[PDB]
Symmetry: D2
Subunit: 461 residues, 4 copies
Amino acid sequence: GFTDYKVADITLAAWGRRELIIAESEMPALMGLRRKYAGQQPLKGAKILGCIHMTIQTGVLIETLVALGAEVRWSSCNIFSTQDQAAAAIAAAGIPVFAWKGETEEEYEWCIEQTILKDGQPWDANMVLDDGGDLTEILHKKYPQMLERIHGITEETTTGVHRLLDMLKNGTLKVPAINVNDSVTKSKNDNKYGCRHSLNDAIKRGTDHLLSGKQALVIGYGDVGKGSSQSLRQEGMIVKVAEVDPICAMQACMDGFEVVSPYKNGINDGTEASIDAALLGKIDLIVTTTGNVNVCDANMLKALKKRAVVCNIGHFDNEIDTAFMRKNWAWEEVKPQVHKIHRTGKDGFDAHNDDYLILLAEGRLVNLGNATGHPSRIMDGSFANQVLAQIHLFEQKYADLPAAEKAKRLSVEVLPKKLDEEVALEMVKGFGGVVTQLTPKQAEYIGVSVEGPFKPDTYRY
Amino acid sequence: AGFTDYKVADITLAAWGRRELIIAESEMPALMGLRRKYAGQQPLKGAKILGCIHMTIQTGVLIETLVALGAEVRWSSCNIFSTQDQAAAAIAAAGIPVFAWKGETEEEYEWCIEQTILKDGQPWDANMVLDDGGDLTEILHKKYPQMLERIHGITEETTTGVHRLLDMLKNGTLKVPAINVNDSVTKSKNDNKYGCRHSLNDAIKRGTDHLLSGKQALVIGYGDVGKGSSQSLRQEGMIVKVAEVDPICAMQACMDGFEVVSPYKNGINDGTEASIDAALLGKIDLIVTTTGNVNVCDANMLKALKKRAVVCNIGHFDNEIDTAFMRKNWAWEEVKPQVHKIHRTGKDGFDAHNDDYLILLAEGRLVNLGNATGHPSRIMDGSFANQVLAQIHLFEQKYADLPAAEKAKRLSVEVLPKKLDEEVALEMVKGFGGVVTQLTPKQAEYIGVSVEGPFKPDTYRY
Amino acid sequence: AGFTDYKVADITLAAWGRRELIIAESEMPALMGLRRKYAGQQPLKGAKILGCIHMTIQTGVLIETLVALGAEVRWSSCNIFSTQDQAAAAIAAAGIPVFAWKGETEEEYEWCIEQTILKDGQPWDANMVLDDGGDLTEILHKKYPQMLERIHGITEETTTGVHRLLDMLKNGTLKVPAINVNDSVTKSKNDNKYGCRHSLNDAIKRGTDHLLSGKQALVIGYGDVGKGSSQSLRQEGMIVKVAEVDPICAMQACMDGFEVVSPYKNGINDGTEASIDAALLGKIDLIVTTTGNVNVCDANMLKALKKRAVVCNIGHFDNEIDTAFMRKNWAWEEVKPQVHKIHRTGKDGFDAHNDDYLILLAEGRLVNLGNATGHPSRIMDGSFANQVLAQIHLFEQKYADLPAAEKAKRLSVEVLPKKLDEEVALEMVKGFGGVVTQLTPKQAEYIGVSVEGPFKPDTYRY
Amino acid sequence: PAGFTDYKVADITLAAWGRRELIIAESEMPALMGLRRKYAGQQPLKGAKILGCIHMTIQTGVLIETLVALGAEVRWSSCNIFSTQDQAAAAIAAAGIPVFAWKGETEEEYEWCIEQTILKDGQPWDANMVLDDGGDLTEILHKKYPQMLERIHGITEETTTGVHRLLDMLKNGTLKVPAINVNDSVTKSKNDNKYGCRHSLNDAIKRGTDHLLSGKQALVIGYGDVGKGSSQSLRQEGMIVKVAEVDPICAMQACMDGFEVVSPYKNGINDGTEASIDAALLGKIDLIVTTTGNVNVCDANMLKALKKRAVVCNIGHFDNEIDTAFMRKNWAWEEVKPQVHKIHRTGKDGFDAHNDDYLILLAEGRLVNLGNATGHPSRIMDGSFANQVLAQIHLFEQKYADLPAAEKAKRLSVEVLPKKLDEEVALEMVKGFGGVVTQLTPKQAEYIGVSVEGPFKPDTYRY
Ligand SMILES: NC(=O)c1ccc[n+]([C@@H]2O[C@H](COP(=O)([O-])OP(=O)(O)OC[C@H]3O[C@@H](n4cnc5c(N)ncnc54)[C@H](O)[C@@H]3O)[C@@H](O)[C@H]2O)c1
Ligand SMILES: NC(=O)c1ccc[n+]([C@@H]2O[C@H](COP(=O)([O-])OP(=O)(O)OC[C@H]3O[C@@H](n4cnc5c(N)ncnc54)[C@H](O)[C@@H]3O)[C@@H](O)[C@H]2O)c1
Ligand SMILES: NC(=O)c1ccc[n+]([C@@H]2O[C@H](COP(=O)([O-])OP(=O)(O)OC[C@H]3O[C@@H](n4cnc5c(N)ncnc54)[C@H](O)[C@@H]3O)[C@@H](O)[C@H]2O)c1
Ligand SMILES: NC(=O)c1ccc[n+]([C@@H]2O[C@H](COP(=O)([O-])OP(=O)(O)OC[C@H]3O[C@@H](n4cnc5c(N)ncnc54)[C@H](O)[C@@H]3O)[C@@H](O)[C@H]2O)c1
Ligand SMILES: Nc1ncnc2[nH]cnc12
Ligand SMILES: Nc1ncnc2[nH]cnc12
Ligand SMILES: [K+]
Ligand SMILES: [K+]
Ligand SMILES: [K+]
Ligand SMILES: [K+]
């Protein structure tokens, strides 16, 4: 009688299992890790606190961690991103998981606490896997004593890495961490091509709007912004791109996009007069991709074309000033995670009012909120890096080191390029691709081993 | 008039070249912005630069920016087919020593580099080097090592030349510090990729006028040049297959919508005819090498290619294709300059109506420069603004005058600071009419950057 | 008050459906412009329309447009999986007879059509027909020919339906005139092509959540639906191969950048397993049928497909794929509604971890409507504005009131005039914010058109 | 051969180069060469004497020698002053074929060349067939040599503009011989007109200016077949492309294809005033391309409002799409190189060499793909010219000029080739790509109501 969980509906487990079995066929790098390390059990004794979107993809990651010896206790890192049939299957396997689609902010916090506490006392955790830094922050701020037993953190996403680096700079980071985000088989696969697959997916499921022929403004052109812009452009949208980074802006120009600012001459002085009203008045869809704060602000929201769609695909919802919209405009739910925002005011609304905006997933990550996030064959790359990161930090056993040996290892690092390449090769084989093997003379000519790595650490791909 | 310190194909093309120089200047905002900003200061006063890079219209604007900031130069091209003769003529007519013409022989190529090095039979008093591929660098280190005692730095343009510098650094044979210009983001991620996107299909069309839509291409390599080359062909409607040895680059080719194949069964290049995937190669209409490696389109691949396939290389050196094998065994028929039919029916003579032939472009030399005009001005703007900033930094450092302990700390191969990379990019963006947004103080603090930048950690790959 | 003349899944979905109808109205300017232009004229007053077409949100706006113009209707869906239950619910809640739900049996499908034809157990006094695919038209001609004596015309939505109409016409068995709505340019080259571009990858993602970039697709057919489908997949990064029997369409596939291949060696389908290009099919991750033909993904093809490939159909009827062979021979595992794993290991049982299976979507029925929502409102706006114009025209012509001698002269299958096609297109373009230029009198004179149009001869193919 | 001087080309020594490129081009034109091999034994054009007027390119060389291989005699000229490839003209003259064509003709030289085909040894040639591209030869015959039309069996016209001119003459009863509309074969219109311009428009702009196109703003006037292909030529290079149209159906396609549809005039109303120009819009355009076959679609007021240093070019058949006459009258022309001019908007008399207020005009407004590059590639022209050959055989064998008046009345029309021949051309093109077309089963052919051999579509089908 396993009861150490809470999900939406355990009877969805059989359905979840069916989709997990399909997902395993789509994740050869991760399943290959199961075969390669099975006999060795390299995570035997590992006790992992996990906080990441409880999708079918995360389900295969969890079961890969367990198959190598680990115990885990899991939550989602977003209130809307759980696939309830995935949570159900994991719970039915006898794995502690606290997650469902549509949590409140209170339930979100309570779910993280259930992974941290077992039977009212702190679990004897020794590893952390995190996506966005929320679980990392709670441990450091509320349970700092637990971190004295934890060998490391493996952090998934750009926002989480930035938070780790601030703590390292401030001397407040307690354990070593691996920047999983900056593997090329993560950042240049997950962040870019994943959003390419799943952004227009989420908009279609939410609105069923034709995108071809319409005008879109993508805020930001990093890895997420690049993939988001392509998601829309390949559908036939006329895509404009905003950036604060001139190098990323240069790439947008060369990639065939027009680079614009919401503000006249790019200066955001906070006034309505600074808004390029003629530009915003033409935009049918705006997507924030920055990891920054308030990049679709109240003045932009006021100036947007009637019936434009507004959504965010960065990690946190504060990219869009939804607070302003909750205070001043009336919200009409169309269906879960789809709201019309009536700009006529808060005192009710005319059900036939034409002056509204459509917000997706209440500003939360739209690909996971209104669809299913990245597909398995893309998450294969990210989560293979996660398993390798867990094994690397666990086998180092930072918490057992003499104090005079910890300082050398208290760091935030990426995986070595050899691991990056190993993950990439299994992905390529998954597509049926054939990689050419260098001859000894060719390897000597370009100064590499036939085994790799094939690029210096400076290389940007 | 009075000035004879040059050798170009035809000085009377100078007015035409000057007309195209004036057009190019309006297409190169970052390079002309540096010209205006530093003209008053003359930061290159006293610089004597040996330059070796494709003598194009774009290089002309580079050359005249350096002279406008106070430098004297002596110039040659780094390839036998890449010079634009009207550009060379306009430079020589401006009183600037230049030795370069389209269609040099290998002996003439070496002689041109030597005419920059030597003035009146003696070594010039050079103190700065600008190189593209390392040929000039190599000649100075091997044949004129005494000149390097007075040279303050090398600014190297391209991936192949940077590799040669890093081997010398490791060995302790590099005599002066270098800036890796190639690895500025406004170079590698602009020039190497987007440049080849523009000029690869440009060169193939000028050489053959072949329709590319619906035909089969094989791109060897998926680095920056291979990425841009694959897009150049795919946007024209080619069905593009990609070969790689780097599984990460291979992964990118898959996600970008390409089928990743190897010329060899299971990727094993064992040097036998039986290793060739003859079925795959018998279906390819166009093969392009982009690797910077050697013999990636070998003799057995050439024997296996579909009849009348086009063969070209867009990497720096021609040994990516085994053209030596073709000269030894097959008959060459010139369609027109830099376009040869290579008849696989024998070495001596050919039937004018033979159908078993390949079309080689630029005799295997860099095809975008050999059969067209290379990258466009607005792209070379970024590369060449980096070159000017690099020359300024190394000339002002005055390495050759530093104490030994200082020399040891500065003898390195380095890239320009990210802040300068961003400033080049900002001028490129404004050239397109783009508008970059300014962070609020709160937004800048939130992501931990100055409002002025730099906006990314040095680890960032873009 | 006490309306019971309907059958839907869940009437409590009505409020949800009305919210989505109000949104759809803002996405359909051509259809809503018709509603506003003709509302006061009431041109369909007296019309009684039997409607058989996918009971989607978009059909809801069509239904309420006809009612707003004066008509009474009785409605059913033309496919067992295409209904959106919240749309059906909203239409029923408005007091409009509708018999439709997602997931009907074949028996329930026929029953729903009969409920539109019969009111209180007797033939309804219908006088207009709106059909999509010809199922209702066929049932009327075969089982209720006396009702056709009072019917003024049929307006037929789709390619397969038009072909069935033209077959009846040449056989002298068609009883009332029809308008071919499919072949308006704002239908055929909008709906059939761009609609499938939007909704094909949409449905595959909802059903499987499979990554498409980098995998291999085979599209059977390259008419309007095949053109749109191939783009739906190529824009996602698939490597797409195209099969055709029409050499002109195949020519377009080549020029559009696709490799044209055949499931059969040398294109010859002799019925044996030996004719299957097994090498080609063993590399295919996804096959899509787009033909309107029969058995174009046959049993031998299904046997040769790569393990875990996806199989789907986007033509009108499920007989493009030999799903009957698979029901007879292989074991079906339901993943979720309209998604089945078909285990090629045998008919009786299956191993839950067997790797030799195919994923069939929507049991071979129209996949864009079975696994997603079909075309989006702004595309269906053009199709359904054409339907409303066609209904008005045939109802106003009053064919059924003519003497036999006059009926014979007007019995035919026609398309709408180009001037109307253009006027629908103008409202669509305005919906995007586009601005159409007006010819000067001298420009109009020069190319031989009127300033207001039509702008092209009837032979123009666009 | 010895004694042959009945030609006029730039440089006869270019013939060997031209022959080398014709031999390559034959390997790229399977549909045309298959017709040459199919009909060689029969000589279906023995006795044909063809007046030909079409761009004297390498691709036209292959068409000319196919016609001669099937028995025809021909006398040839180009249909544009800038479109001839001099090595193609040289190879044809050296083969003993009369041709009067060189790149860079004056208007006087152009008309002289057409007359040299019409006249042989000072008298009208006894021609009996016409192959035309644009209708200029057809117009000269009807207006200046009408008596020659009494012996001519037909005209085979290549392009949209020429077909419009033919239909105008038919409507007014002024057309004297029947014609085949070669343009509206699907293997012509939806191959040549669209995909040809996709290949060759960005080709010509790069050769003329070597400008980066990616990231820049383009305005394409028209979205017919040429405008569709032109817009793709630019968009696939990374340009931001806006599209202007008077036809809302073509405008609808532009929207659905992912382009923003705009007008040079406020609210699309062209009242002739400067105030009607959307000056903000045209002030952002780096490249304008006209594709309409209409008159003055890039007018003087538009040219005054264009962004500084914008490129201006036309890819429709005639140069009057751009008001170049206004520019000749008011602005100073600085030649960069042949077929590339800087137009200085600072005045007529003289210009500053470093002036920044200029436009770049390509090919002096003439069809830019043929003027600044080589036009469509051989594998595309294969389809158009296979159609031309079939059209010539049909009209010559019909022998219109030999029919009694009543039989002529039934035949005096402008027609297209049957779909079955359209399909047979497409099939050879597909095979040239290595494509494999599937054969219907008898049951399938019966299911959709076609023959296993085709035709596979009704005549109404638009593809
Ligand atoms: N939803 C998903 O599936 C998913 C996947 C990966 C990452 N993410 C999240 O998306 C966010 C972005 O990640 P990334 O990897 O692209 O980071 P990134 O650093 O590569 O890119 C962010 C970009 O935003 C730009 N930017 C910042 N402030 C801006 C402003 N005010 N206006 C315009 N541009 C501005 C920066 O210049 C930068 O180029 C992070 O929060 C990350 O965690 C989400
Ligand atoms: N022609 C131009 O305009 C131009 C511009 C820039 C650079 N280049 C030259 O092009 C070359 C490539 O430059 P880059 O910046 O792309 O370098 P890069 O290192 O980024 O890319 C080269 C790629 O080739 C691959 N490779 C090596 N050997 C291979 C083999 N046998 N088979 C398949 N793939 C193989 C490597 O894995 C690598 O990804 C260099 O010689 C450079 O100097 C030319
Ligand atoms: N699902 C949708 O939303 C939707 C929309 C419009 C039409 N349709 C349906 O899709 C079908 C196709 O419509 P269309 O307008 O594209 O028709 P079409 O006539 O334009 O195209 C069908 C194509 O299939 C080809 N074909 C026929 N038999 C073939 C075979 N054995 N192998 C390969 N190709 C073959 C034909 O040559 C033709 O080009 C019809 O059933 C139509 O009713 C569906
Ligand atoms: N250069 C080449 O290689 C080449 C090839 C084929 C045809 N052509 C020529 O190009 C021209 C166009 O041919 P096509 O086949 O595209 O014809 P088309 O009829 O298909 O297209 C012309 C389009 O221009 C539009 N148009 C007319 N006036 C306009 C205006 N004022 N503003 C905007 N749009 C306007 C029309 O609505 C029409 O859609 C003809 O002169 C033809 O002979 C040139
Ligand atoms: N499907 C997914 N599962 C987990 N994390 C994700 N991030 C983006 N997509 C995801
Ligand atoms: N959404 C939709 N509604 C009705 N008919 C359709 N046909 C295709 N998509 C449709
Ligand atoms: K997913
Ligand atoms: K250039
Ligand atoms: K829909
Ligand atoms: K050509």
